[PDB]
């Protein structure tokens, strides 16, 4: 129940604001900046500010704070969802999120803000649907918004019906400094880039553990996703009844389903780090990386970030495989590897000096994070079975999909 959603800037200047209820004076935005400065300087800064009886909820964008003031006990979650939808719409319409576009497309920006929500109640959220009525370069509103299918525009015609899927894997590993992995969760991501003619209704079928058990085929390798969240086009009733994944695919790239379950397998990369840090004399980086993934798989663009000392200087690198570059901006050593075949073992020996003068304050021990990304690898073993592409006119579809395994929250606690 936000009173007015506004777009601010890094210097406190409001790029654009649009009142929806009018219950709060527009001059309250001036006090938002001092309140944020005080909260940050005292550690009490939070996304939802509070200026007396009015709460100033704001989120940090690429360059501006999307502040949405409110007065009553409105749905904070609803405000957050509206802000996320607005951010997605801005990203779709504007390729850049900075002050260069905020002051460059205000003519269409005002119309989009007016059309998106009214009186604090969001009404339009389809970026593709909104692009059919609001353009920066007007006809009646499309019937798709009025119709039940607001995620599949009818009448779309394509020369070919090719859909590019994406089996994106997220390997999140939380290895403590004691050597044990605490948080080992893998989040699936079934994203498809559908480009076909008409309004096809995808009939998804994969190797799910629940589906195999229900059909009686619970004996092969089936993925038991702890959390499975369908997209907007996905029908909740069909999945609730018999795990029937039937929905109308959108026009373009969209996230249909996203698996989320814990992992009980060994890490794909085993990283052993050593710290022979002399007392203000030198430091040793006994970093050893063991690839626990299958030898048939290669981790392309592997970047094992090793945090070096804050005041460290004059580093010397004695490694075996992979380029090592010390970036002073990040204050860490990135064990950069172009391609890392599975089962590889790379040994590195860092050595640098330290200033004689001791530091006045501690710097902390940031965790070691790697940026491995091995495509065409399915650690979870979930295999897609079929995708029921049905059209009223009738056409032969040629769906495509690629499985990509990358490194997510794969942080390693430092000693």
């Amino acid at each position: 129940s936000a009173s007015a959603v506004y777009v601010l800037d890094l210097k406190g200047k409001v790029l654009i604001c649009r009142n929806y209820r009018g219950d709060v004076d527009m001059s309250e935005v001036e006090h938002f900046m001092p309140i944020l400065m005080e909260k940050e300087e005292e550690g009490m800064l939070s996304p939802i500010l509070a200026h007396g009886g009015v709460r100033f909820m704001w989120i940090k964008h690429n360059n501006l704070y999307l502040v949405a003031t409110s007065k009553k006990n409105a749905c904070v979650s609803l405000v957050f969802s509206f802000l996320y939808k607005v951010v997605q719409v801005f990203s779709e319409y504007f390729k850049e999120l900075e002050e260069e576009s905020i002051r460059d497309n205000f003519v269409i920006i005002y119309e989009l803000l007016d059309e998106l929500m009214d009186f604090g109640y969001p009404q339009t959220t389809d970026s593709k649907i909104l692009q059919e009525y609001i353009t920066q370069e007007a006809p009646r509103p499309p019937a798709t918004v009025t119709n039940a299918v607001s995620w599949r525009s009818e009448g779309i015609k394509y020369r070919k019906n090719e859909v590019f899927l994406d089996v994106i894997e997220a390997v999140n590993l939380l290895v403590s400094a004691n050597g044990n992995v605490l948080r080992s969760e893998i989040v699936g991501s079934i994203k498809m880039r559908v480009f076909l003619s008409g309004m096809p209704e995808l009939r998804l079928g994969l190797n799910d553990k629940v589906l195999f058990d229900n059909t009686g085929r619970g004996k092969s390798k089936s993925v038991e996703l702890e959390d499975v969240k369908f997209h907007q086009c996905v029908r909740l009733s069909r999945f609730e009844n018999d795990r029937t994944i039937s929905f109308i695919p959108p026009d373009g790239e969209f996230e249909l389903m996203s698996y989320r379950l814990n992992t009980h397998v060994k890490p794909l990369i085993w990283i052993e780090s050593v710290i022979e840090k002399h007392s203000h004399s030198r430091i040793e980086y006994m970093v050893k990386a063991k690839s626990q993934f299958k030898r048939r798989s290669t981790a392309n663009n592997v970047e094992i970030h090793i945090p070096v000392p804050n005041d460290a200087d004059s580093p010397k690198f004695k490694t075996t495989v992979g380029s090592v570059k010390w970036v002073p901006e990040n204050s860490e050593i990135v064990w950069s590897v172009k391609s890392f075949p599975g089962g590889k073992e790379y040994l590195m020996r860092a050595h640098f000096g330290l200033p004689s003068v001791e530091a006045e304050d501690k710097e902390g021990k940031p965790p070691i994070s790697v940026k491995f990304e091995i495509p065409y690898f399915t650690t979870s073993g979930i295999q897609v079975r079929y995708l029921k592409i049905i059209e009223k006119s009738g056409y032969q579809a040629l769906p495509w999909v690629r499985y990509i395994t990358q490194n997510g929250d794969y942080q390693l606690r430092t000693q």
Partner: protein
């Protein structure tokens, strides 16, 4: 500038009118008071171009309260535009009519609102529903006089799921501001009809549809079972707010569910994966998810019993998320994951957040106090932290030890020697007072208690009132226990706190202690050094009456602030 803009706007060329409108819009956005030119733009309002009409409407809405008198020259244009064949123009006019905060302007807009109430366009229906809600918020009496309640009620029973959701949201908002009199509650048929359109409502329509169920109170288990069965699919929605609304609805319905039936177990099993999914959301919604979990934790704590790994704060997690993670872990602390909690707290004590370090120390102390099975582990962790040579950590460990001693001091005699020499030079009032109290109450395992208290007696008359009282209590306890080595110390303390102490409460305490010492030293052991009863810890659980009310208020501002809905609004 202003004169040139006025001359351009007073011309018959559309090309210059568009440029003038763009310049005026840029000036207002740049922070220029362009309300003085509002009457000039009034003449250049009825234009065929759709781009300039939106700008004119926006300028009028933004220049309506500033110049209410000059706004009387816009009713005719709105009335003319309220019948345009283009649905977009009608929707824009409906939105602009409700956005004008004019008391004398909404009076003449009732006829267009009545005409557009039966608008065939679903977008037009939504726009009229929004305009009716805006008019009712501006004038509840005007809305009642116009008789729009019947039309809003009949809107929910028509086609257009988006328009139906908008009408339901408008009705809920009107009833939200209403005094509960003549409520818009509906029977099970209306609930079933809304559930049938729930699968057809949009992302925003789902929230509006689920908000209505938050007010209805089920009376039968079969109806509750059907409602739970229909709300179960809502947990598989990518919209986090829709997931939050569905969780709130399920929790509200669980207040009438029967634990004997298997529906409660299935609902509990299906709620944990939703919580796990919500915990990995965006940082802005992470705090909301944590607040919702904390609010629902006190109601059914057996749902998230096995959800402990996800409660760990991430390295890149925000400060607000890090603070909430510790509270979630403390609320969900159990003996099964005691070792994991201790390991996380030990890792959380090596960070650089001083506030984060203090919060971690407080959480560790709360976990140690709640569960006596890990008391030895907590004591060992506190000793290691004290040996960590951290000033804030040292004060936190001293406070934790002092709190633990008053709670479980039966087997706390093995730590007095270690804490006897732990760099007592710290001047923190919360740590020095705790150390003094621990020494006074635990003045048996330390053979040099009198010598340690000598250093703290140099500035007793100007240390602190609480510190002075604690030192006096420790001296009295030491004299009562061992008066051979503290016979002169008690007299010195009485002289310093009775003659050179000007504190009223401190002076009274010193006088009482002196009177007790001069009356009967034998009785002082049974009067001053008595065995205190069990200390009643402050229960962190909210009151049952407040918990039930917070259950209905799910997703609102009151859940993050942990305050009553009427205790935070103005």
């Amino acid at each position: 500038e202003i004169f040139e803009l006025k001359a351009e706007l007073n011309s018959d060329k559309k090309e210059k009118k568009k440029e003038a409108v763009k310049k005026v819009i840029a000036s207002m956005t740049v922070g220029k008071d362009v309300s003085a030119l509002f009457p000039d733009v009034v003449n250049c309002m009825q234009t065929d171009n759709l781009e300039l009409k939106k700008l004119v409407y926006l300028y009028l809405m933004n220049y309506a309260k500033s110049q209410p008198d000059m706004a009387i020259m816009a009713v005719n244009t709105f009335v003319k535009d309220c019948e345009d064949p283009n649905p977009l123009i009608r929707a824009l006019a409906v939105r602009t009519m409700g956005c004008i905060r004019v008391d004398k302007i909404t009076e003449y807009l009732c006829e267009p609102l009545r005409k557009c109430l039966k608008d065939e366009d679903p977008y037009v229906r939504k726009t009229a529903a929004v305009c009716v809600a805006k008019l009712h918020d501006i004038n509840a009496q005007l809305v009642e006089d116009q008789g729009f309640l019947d039309t809003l009620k009949d809107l929910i029973s028509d086609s257009n799921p988006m328009v139906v959701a908008n009408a339901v949201a408008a009705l809920s908002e009107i009833a939200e501001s209403h005094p509960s009199s003549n409520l818009l509650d509906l029977n099970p048929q209306s609930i079933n009809k809304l559930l049938t359109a729930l699968n057809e409502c949009t992302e925003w329509g789902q929230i509006f549809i689920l908000d209505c169920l938050a007010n209805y109170m089920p009376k039968d288990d079969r109806e509750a079972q059907s409602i739970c069965e229909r709300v179960t699919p809502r947990l598989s929605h990518a919209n986090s707010a829709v997931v939050l609304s569905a969780v709130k609805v399920l929790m509200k319905f669980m207040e009438m569910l029967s634990k004997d039936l298997d529906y409660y177990g299935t609902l509990l099993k299906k709620l944990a994966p939703p919580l796990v999914t919500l915990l990995s959301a965006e940082p802005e919604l992470q705090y909301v998810a944590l607040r919702n979990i904390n609010l629902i934790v006190q109601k059914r704590p057996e749902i998230l019993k096995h959800e402990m790994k996800v409660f760990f704060v991430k390295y890149n997690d925000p400060i607000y998320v890090k603070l909430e993670k510790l509270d979630i872990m403390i609320r969900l602390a159990s003996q099964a994951n005691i070792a994991q909690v201790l390991a996380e707290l030990r890792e959380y004590a090596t960070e650089v957040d001083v506030d984060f370090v203090r919060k971690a120390v407080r959480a560790i102390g709360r976990c140690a106090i709640k569960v006596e099975q890990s008391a030895e582990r907590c004591v060992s962790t506190l000793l290691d932290l004290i040996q960590t040579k951290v000033n804030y950590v040292v004060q936190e460990a001293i406070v934790v030890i002092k709190d633990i001693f008053r709670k479980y001091p039966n087997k706390y005699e093995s730590v007095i020697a270690t804490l006897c020499e732990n760099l007592d030079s710290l001047d923190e009032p919360e740590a020095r007072a705790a150390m003094i109290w621990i020494v006074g109450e635990y003045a048996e395992r330390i053979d040099n208690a009198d010598e340690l208290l000598e250093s703290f007696l140099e500035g007793f008359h100007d240390k602190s009132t609480q510190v002075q009282l604690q030192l006096l209590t420790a001296i009295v306890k030491l004299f009562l226990k061992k008066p051979t080595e503290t016979q002169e110390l008690v007299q010195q303390v009485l002289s310093l706190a009775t003659q050179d102490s000007d504190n009223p409460d401190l002076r009274d305490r010193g006088y009482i202690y002196w009177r007790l010492l001069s009356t009967d030293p034998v009785a002082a052991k049974e009067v001053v050094l008595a065995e205190k009863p069990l200390i009643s810890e402050e229960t962190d659980l909210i009151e049952p009456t407040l918990l039930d009310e917070l259950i209905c208020y799910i997703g609102t501002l009151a859940s993050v602030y942990h305050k009553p809905p009427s205790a935070f609004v103005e």
